[PDB]
Amino acid sequence: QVKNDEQDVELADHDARIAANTKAINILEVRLTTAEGKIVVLRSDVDYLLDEVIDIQAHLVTVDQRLDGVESDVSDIKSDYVSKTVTESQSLASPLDVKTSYSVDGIQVVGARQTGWTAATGTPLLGSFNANQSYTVGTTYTQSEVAALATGLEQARQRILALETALRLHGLID
Amino acid sequence: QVKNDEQDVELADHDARIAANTKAINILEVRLTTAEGKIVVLRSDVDYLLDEVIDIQAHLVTVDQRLDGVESDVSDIKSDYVSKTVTESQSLASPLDVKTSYSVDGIQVVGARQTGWTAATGTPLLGSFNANQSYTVGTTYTQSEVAALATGLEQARQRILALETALRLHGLID
Amino acid sequence: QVKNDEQDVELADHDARIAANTKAINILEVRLTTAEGKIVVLRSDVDYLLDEVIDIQAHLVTVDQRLDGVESDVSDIKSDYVSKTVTESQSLASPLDVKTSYSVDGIQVVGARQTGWTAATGTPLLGSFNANQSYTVGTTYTQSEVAALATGLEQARQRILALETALRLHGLID
Ligand SMILES: [Ca+2]
Ligand SMILES: [Cl-]
């Protein structure tokens, strides 16, 4: 009989210990369930971040491409453009047209083509021209002396023609 | 009899099993504690990352605006600037002033305005001018022939005046 | 003997409950192992992301610097460049060379230097020049009248020289 109370005592002990284990298991289960939930949310956030960074890194590739493009175009303009402050002569590969005038050193040297001219006719003299030729004129009429005047006048008129033709070919006059 | 031999054996069995469960439960507690702690640190890191990515994406929005701005400015300059390498004629909506000279095909055509001129007086001859007019000069004096020289000289001088007037009006001479 | 069956009942209950806890522990172990595994993968992902944002933020500093660079260069070009659409006069600090021609208001005023000229010689007349000077020519030969004609011709020729010299110094003719 009292061998049996000793069995009753241990059964009660086991019962308390089993109940304690059950309670401990339940506490662990809930903690784990809570932890599992947080892992899912962490996974959701991290998957979001991974997708974001992929998008960010792709965007940065585009940004680098756009920067390279604009740096290249700026570089091209820098080497190709006519500057207002550069002192060394600048050359265009094209003709040039402007409004109303061309100036040198703040002073107009060339304006619009001047019209109203009738073009002179004849053969232009581009050859030797002696402007200091003195023409002898005697007390008496000498055909050769007046003929020298005639020759000299014709030379002058053909030189005028040469000058006029030069301006017309340039476009300074009509 | 064999009554209690069998119950004590099972009680000993239960005791060992309860203790085994207890030791296994405790091991789970340690592992779970470590895992819970790692979850806290991960959440801290992910929260940090979430803020970084928000900041980065805001920065990238600004970058795109700035890229838009500079690309637009470059585009406007591109269409508005005078190029040194384009072969087709370029036109300014303004007059132009340069230092010391204008050249065509690498050769100076126009320089600074030349001073020191006294303006000629008279009526410029813009009409017909025959540079090949020949002036007959005979063996003997003929009024009409010498008068033809006078007329031709007056014409020539008035044509010179017309040219000089053109140059002064352009600004090539003062 | 009335009492021992009651122990049989409780022992059976304990056996079932202990077995339930043992299995429950095993189930928790599996869940915990799964969670621990996911935590490791999460850590690898987060560690990757932590390094990524460091690289991205360094990149963004570089981007802002590059944006600063082009914005600065665009700004410099904008103030320095010759514009095709501005209406008010533009000035170059340099000489200018162009291809084939200069035009004003859509019409060519200056072309290439014209060659083939031999320089006229003499003393250029830059002084007073009266183009309306009339030369009297009488019925009979008069030296003073023809001498005045000679004087007028020399003046005309020397004025031509002055004009030609002006054109040559500009570079409009060789
Ligand atoms: Ca018993
Ligand atoms: Cl148990």
Side-chain angles (χ1 to χ4, degrees):
Chain A
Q1 173 183 41
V2 298
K3 196 164 152 17
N4 237 319
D5 301 5
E6 145 74 18
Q7 285 179 339
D8 286 340
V9 166
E10 191 184 7
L11 280 166
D13 175 66
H14 288 179
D15 182 64
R17 286 164 60 194
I18 293 163
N21 282 352
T22 300
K23 190 181 254 302
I25 288 165
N26 174 60
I27 288 174
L28 285 183
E29 204 284 331
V30 177
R31 286 174 57 188
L32 182 54
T33 294
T34 294
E36 286 171 336
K38 288 170 183 176
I39 291 171
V40 174
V41 171
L42 280 165
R43 173 45 64 191
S44 186
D45 289 346
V46 167
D47 281 351
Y48 171 77
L49 289 168
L50 287 171
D51 278 337
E52 281 292 296
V53 167
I54 287 173
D55 289 343
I56 289 171
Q57 292 283 34
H59 195 168
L60 280 176
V61 170
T62 302
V63 166
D64 281 7
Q65 289 169 356
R66 294 179 72 184
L67 282 172
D68 289 351
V70 68
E71 285 169 353
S72 174
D73 282 348
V74 163
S75 175
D76 290 345
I77 292 167
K78 264 193 193 187
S79 62
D80 196 46
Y81 86 97
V82 179
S83 161
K84 293 186 293 193
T85 56
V86 152
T87 59
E88 81 150 321
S89 176
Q90 296 174 93
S91 179
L92 285 40
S94 72
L96 179 68
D97 174 41
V98 306
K99 172 76 172 183
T100 299
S101 68
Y102 290 99
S103 293
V104 169
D105 300 338
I107 289 107
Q108 175 182 324
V109 289
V110 178
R113 174 181 298 178
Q114 304 175 12
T115 57
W117 287 70
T118 294
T121 62
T123 309
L125 190 152
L126 291 80
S128 52
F129 191 78
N130 180 21
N132 278 12
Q133 180 168 350
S134 307
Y135 300 101
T136 305
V137 175
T139 63
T140 169
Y141 178 85
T142 307
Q143 169 177 37
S144 61
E145 293 180 345
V146 183
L149 279 174
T151 298
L153 177 55
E154 290 165 20
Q155 287 171 351
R157 289 163 66 89
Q158 287 162 12
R159 191 64 157 199
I160 295 169
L161 169 65
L163 289 173
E164 177 187 322
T165 300
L167 284 41
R168 180 167 295 105
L169 180 62
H170 271 294
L172 293 165
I173 63 174
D174 58 345
Chain B
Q1 183 186 34
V2 296
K3 176 80 161 48
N4 274 86
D5 314 60
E6 300 185 55
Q7 286 179 340
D8 286 341
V9 165
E10 193 185 8
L11 280 167
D13 174 66
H14 289 180
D15 182 65
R17 287 165 61 194
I18 293 163
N21 283 351
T22 297
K23 188 175 216 78
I25 286 165
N26 286 336
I27 288 174
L28 283 182
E29 198 171 54
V30 175
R31 288 175 58 188
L32 182 54
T33 292
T34 295
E36 285 170 335
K38 287 172 183 176
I39 285 173
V40 171
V41 172
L42 279 164
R43 172 44 65 192
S44 186
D45 290 345
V46 170
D47 283 351
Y48 173 78
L49 288 168
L50 287 170
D51 275 337
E52 281 291 297
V53 169
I54 288 173
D55 170 47
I56 289 170
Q57 292 283 34
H59 194 167
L60 279 175
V61 169
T62 302
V63 166
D64 280 7
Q65 290 169 357
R66 295 180 73 185
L67 282 171
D68 288 351
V70 68
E71 286 171 353
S72 174
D73 281 347
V74 166
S75 176
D76 289 345
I77 293 167
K78 265 191 195 186
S79 62
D80 196 45
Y81 87 95
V82 180
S83 160
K84 292 187 292 193
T85 56
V86 296
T87 60
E88 295 165 336
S89 176
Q90 297 175 93
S91 180
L92 284 41
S94 72
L96 178 66
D97 174 41
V98 308
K99 251 278 169 281
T100 298
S101 68
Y102 289 98
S103 293
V104 170
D105 298 337
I107 299 299
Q108 177 180 324
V109 285
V110 176
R113 173 180 296 177
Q114 304 175 12
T115 58
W117 286 72
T118 295
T121 61
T123 309
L125 190 152
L126 294 181
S128 53
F129 189 77
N130 180 8
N132 279 13
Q133 178 65 46
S134 192
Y135 302 99
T136 305
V137 176
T139 62
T140 55
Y141 181 86
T142 307
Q143 168 178 37
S144 62
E145 293 180 346
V146 182
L149 275 299
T151 298
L153 176 55
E154 289 164 20
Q155 288 170 351
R157 289 163 65 89
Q158 287 161 13
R159 192 64 159 199
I160 292 169
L161 169 66
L163 288 173
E164 177 187 322
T165 300
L167 290 191
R168 181 167 296 106
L169 245 185
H170 271 294
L172 294 165
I173 63 174
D174 62 348
Chain C
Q1 327 306 326
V2 177
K3 144 183 147 188
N4 75 308
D5 311 286
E6 302 185 54
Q7 286 178 340
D8 288 341
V9 165
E10 195 186 350
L11 280 166
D13 175 66
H14 287 182
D15 184 23
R17 287 166 61 194
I18 294 163
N21 282 351
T22 297
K23 192 178 177 177
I25 289 165
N26 286 334
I27 288 174
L28 282 181
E29 270 176 30
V30 176
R31 288 175 58 188
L32 182 53
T33 293
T34 298
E36 286 171 335
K38 287 171 183 176
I39 285 173
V40 173
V41 173
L42 280 165
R43 173 46 64 191
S44 71
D45 290 345
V46 169
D47 282 351
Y48 172 79
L49 289 168
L50 288 171
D51 277 337
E52 280 292 297
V53 297
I54 290 174
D55 290 344
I56 290 170
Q57 291 283 34
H59 196 169
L60 281 175
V61 173
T62 304
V63 165
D64 281 8
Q65 289 168 355
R66 293 179 72 184
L67 283 172
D68 289 352
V70 287
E71 287 168 353
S72 173
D73 282 347
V74 162
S75 175
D76 291 345
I77 293 166
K78 265 192 193 187
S79 61
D80 196 46
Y81 86 98
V82 179
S83 160
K84 293 188 293 192
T85 57
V86 298
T87 58
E88 291 139 351
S89 176
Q90 296 175 93
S91 179
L92 289 191
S94 71
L96 179 68
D97 174 41
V98 307
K99 173 75 172 304
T100 298
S101 68
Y102 291 99
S103 293
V104 169
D105 299 339
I107 291 166
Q108 174 180 323
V109 288
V110 175
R113 173 181 296 176
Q114 303 175 12
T115 57
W117 288 72
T118 291
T121 61
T123 308
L125 190 152
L126 295 181
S128 52
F129 189 78
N130 182 22
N132 279 13
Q133 180 65 45
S134 307
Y135 302 97
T136 304
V137 177
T139 323
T140 57
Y141 179 86
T142 307
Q143 147 176 263
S144 61
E145 293 180 346
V146 182
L149 225 33
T151 298
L153 177 54
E154 290 165 20
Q155 287 170 351
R157 290 163 66 88
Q158 287 162 12
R159 191 65 159 199
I160 291 170
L161 169 66
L163 288 173
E164 176 186 321
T165 300
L167 290 190
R168 181 167 296 106
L169 180 62
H170 271 293
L172 293 166
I173 60 174
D174 61 348

PDB file of all heavy atoms in Angstrom, chain A residues 17-18 21-22, chain B residues 17-18 21-22, chain C residues 17-18 21-22, ligand 2:
ATOM      1  N   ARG A  17       5.156  18.135 -14.049  1.00  0.00           N
ATOM      2  CA  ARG A  17       6.268  18.327 -14.976  1.00  0.00           C
ATOM      3  C   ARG A  17       5.801  18.268 -16.432  1.00  0.00           C
ATOM      4  O   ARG A  17       6.267  19.039 -17.273  1.00  0.00           O
ATOM      5  CB  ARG A  17       7.358  17.285 -14.714  1.00  0.00           C
ATOM      6  CG  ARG A  17       8.174  17.554 -13.454  1.00  0.00           C
ATOM      7  CD  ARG A  17       8.962  16.325 -13.016  1.00  0.00           C
ATOM      8  NE  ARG A  17       9.905  15.869 -14.033  1.00  0.00           N
ATOM      9  CZ  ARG A  17      10.509  14.685 -14.007  1.00  0.00           C
ATOM     10  NH1 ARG A  17      10.271  13.843 -13.013  1.00  0.00           N
ATOM     11  NH2 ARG A  17      11.351  14.341 -14.973  1.00  0.00           N
ATOM     12  N   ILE A  18       4.887  17.350 -16.734  1.00  0.00           N
ATOM     13  CA  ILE A  18       4.339  17.253 -18.084  1.00  0.00           C
ATOM     14  C   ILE A  18       3.579  18.528 -18.426  1.00  0.00           C
ATOM     15  O   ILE A  18       3.726  19.076 -19.522  1.00  0.00           O
ATOM     16  CB  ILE A  18       3.406  16.038 -18.238  1.00  0.00           C
ATOM     17  CG1 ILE A  18       4.202  14.738 -18.122  1.00  0.00           C
ATOM     18  CG2 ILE A  18       2.697  16.076 -19.578  1.00  0.00           C
ATOM     19  CD1 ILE A  18       3.339  13.521 -17.855  1.00  0.00           C
ATOM     20  N   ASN A  21       6.001  21.245 -19.141  1.00  0.00           N
ATOM     21  CA  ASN A  21       6.546  21.101 -20.489  1.00  0.00           C
ATOM     22  C   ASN A  21       5.560  21.566 -21.553  1.00  0.00           C
ATOM     23  O   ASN A  21       5.940  22.223 -22.519  1.00  0.00           O
ATOM     24  CB  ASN A  21       6.954  19.652 -20.762  1.00  0.00           C
ATOM     25  CG  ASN A  21       8.271  19.290 -20.110  1.00  0.00           C
ATOM     26  OD1 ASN A  21       8.962  20.149 -19.568  1.00  0.00           O
ATOM     27  ND2 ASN A  21       8.642  18.018 -20.187  1.00  0.00           N
ATOM     28  N   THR A  22       4.294  21.216 -21.369  1.00  0.00           N
ATOM     29  CA  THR A  22       3.237  21.612 -22.298  1.00  0.00           C
ATOM     30  C   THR A  22       3.115  23.133 -22.354  1.00  0.00           C
ATOM     31  O   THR A  22       2.952  23.721 -23.425  1.00  0.00           O
ATOM     32  CB  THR A  22       1.882  21.006 -21.900  1.00  0.00           C
ATOM     33  OG1 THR A  22       1.977  19.577 -21.902  1.00  0.00           O
ATOM     34  CG2 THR A  22       0.790  21.445 -22.869  1.00  0.00           C
TER      35      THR A  22
ATOM     36  N   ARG B  17      11.676  10.153 -20.122  1.00  0.00           N
ATOM     37  CA  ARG B  17      11.099  10.801 -21.292  1.00  0.00           C
ATOM     38  C   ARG B  17      10.736  12.256 -21.003  1.00  0.00           C
ATOM     39  O   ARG B  17      10.955  13.126 -21.843  1.00  0.00           O
ATOM     40  CB  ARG B  17       9.870  10.029 -21.776  1.00  0.00           C
ATOM     41  CG  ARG B  17      10.206   8.711 -22.463  1.00  0.00           C
ATOM     42  CD  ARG B  17       8.977   7.826 -22.596  1.00  0.00           C
ATOM     43  NE  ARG B  17       7.931   8.444 -23.406  1.00  0.00           N
ATOM     44  CZ  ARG B  17       6.674   8.015 -23.452  1.00  0.00           C
ATOM     45  NH1 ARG B  17       6.298   6.973 -22.719  1.00  0.00           N
ATOM     46  NH2 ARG B  17       5.787   8.634 -24.220  1.00  0.00           N
ATOM     47  N   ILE B  18      10.194  12.522 -19.818  1.00  0.00           N
ATOM     48  CA  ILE B  18       9.853  13.891 -19.440  1.00  0.00           C
ATOM     49  C   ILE B  18      11.116  14.751 -19.370  1.00  0.00           C
ATOM     50  O   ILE B  18      11.138  15.878 -19.868  1.00  0.00           O
ATOM     51  CB  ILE B  18       9.113  13.942 -18.087  1.00  0.00           C
ATOM     52  CG1 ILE B  18       7.738  13.285 -18.205  1.00  0.00           C
ATOM     53  CG2 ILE B  18       8.937  15.374 -17.622  1.00  0.00           C
ATOM     54  CD1 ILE B  18       7.124  12.925 -16.868  1.00  0.00           C
ATOM     55  N   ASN B  21      12.387  15.494 -22.841  1.00  0.00           N
ATOM     56  CA  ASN B  21      11.569  16.552 -23.414  1.00  0.00           C
ATOM     57  C   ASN B  21      11.977  17.900 -22.842  1.00  0.00           C
ATOM     58  O   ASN B  21      12.088  18.883 -23.571  1.00  0.00           O
ATOM     59  CB  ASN B  21      10.086  16.301 -23.136  1.00  0.00           C
ATOM     60  CG  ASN B  21       9.495  15.237 -24.030  1.00  0.00           C
ATOM     61  OD1 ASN B  21      10.129  14.783 -24.978  1.00  0.00           O
ATOM     62  ND2 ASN B  21       8.269  14.825 -23.725  1.00  0.00           N
ATOM     63  N   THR B  22      12.213  17.928 -21.533  1.00  0.00           N
ATOM     64  CA  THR B  22      12.626  19.147 -20.851  1.00  0.00           C
ATOM     65  C   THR B  22      13.952  19.668 -21.387  1.00  0.00           C
ATOM     66  O   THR B  22      14.096  20.861 -21.647  1.00  0.00           O
ATOM     67  CB  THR B  22      12.734  18.918 -19.332  1.00  0.00           C
ATOM     68  OG1 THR B  22      11.441  18.576 -18.822  1.00  0.00           O
ATOM     69  CG2 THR B  22      13.223  20.176 -18.636  1.00  0.00           C
TER      70      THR B  22
ATOM     71  N   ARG C  17       0.309  11.962 -23.290  1.00  0.00           N
ATOM     72  CA  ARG C  17       0.674  13.369 -23.167  1.00  0.00           C
ATOM     73  C   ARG C  17       2.171  13.603 -23.378  1.00  0.00           C
ATOM     74  O   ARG C  17       2.566  14.582 -24.010  1.00  0.00           O
ATOM     75  CB  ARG C  17       0.247  13.917 -21.803  1.00  0.00           C
ATOM     76  CG  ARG C  17      -1.254  14.130 -21.669  1.00  0.00           C
ATOM     77  CD  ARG C  17      -1.655  14.334 -20.217  1.00  0.00           C
ATOM     78  NE  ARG C  17      -1.023  15.514 -19.632  1.00  0.00           N
ATOM     79  CZ  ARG C  17      -0.985  15.768 -18.328  1.00  0.00           C
ATOM     80  NH1 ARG C  17      -1.533  14.920 -17.468  1.00  0.00           N
ATOM     81  NH2 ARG C  17      -0.390  16.864 -17.881  1.00  0.00           N
ATOM     82  N   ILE C  18       2.999  12.709 -22.841  1.00  0.00           N
ATOM     83  CA  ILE C  18       4.447  12.804 -23.021  1.00  0.00           C
ATOM     84  C   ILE C  18       4.802  12.628 -24.492  1.00  0.00           C
ATOM     85  O   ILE C  18       5.610  13.377 -25.042  1.00  0.00           O
ATOM     86  CB  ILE C  18       5.199  11.756 -22.172  1.00  0.00           C
ATOM     87  CG1 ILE C  18       5.022  12.055 -20.682  1.00  0.00           C
ATOM     88  CG2 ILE C  18       6.679  11.744 -22.523  1.00  0.00           C
ATOM     89  CD1 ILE C  18       5.354  10.882 -19.770  1.00  0.00           C
ATOM     90  N   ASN C  21       3.952  15.769 -26.366  1.00  0.00           N
ATOM     91  CA  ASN C  21       4.982  16.783 -26.191  1.00  0.00           C
ATOM     92  C   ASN C  21       6.235  16.482 -27.001  1.00  0.00           C
ATOM     93  O   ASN C  21       6.815  17.383 -27.599  1.00  0.00           O
ATOM     94  CB  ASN C  21       5.340  16.945 -24.715  1.00  0.00           C
ATOM     95  CG  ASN C  21       4.316  17.770 -23.958  1.00  0.00           C
ATOM     96  OD1 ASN C  21       3.413  18.361 -24.558  1.00  0.00           O
ATOM     97  ND2 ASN C  21       4.457  17.829 -22.642  1.00  0.00           N
ATOM     98  N   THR C  22       6.649  15.222 -27.025  1.00  0.00           N
ATOM     99  CA  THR C  22       7.832  14.840 -27.789  1.00  0.00           C
ATOM    100  C   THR C  22       7.629  15.151 -29.270  1.00  0.00           C
ATOM    101  O   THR C  22       8.533  15.672 -29.933  1.00  0.00           O
ATOM    102  CB  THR C  22       8.172  13.343 -27.608  1.00  0.00           C
ATOM    103  OG1 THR C  22       8.494  13.088 -26.234  1.00  0.00           O
ATOM    104  CG2 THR C  22       9.368  12.955 -28.457  1.00  0.00           C
TER     105      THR C  22
HETATM  106 CL    CL D   2       6.722  16.022 -21.265  1.00  0.00          CL
END
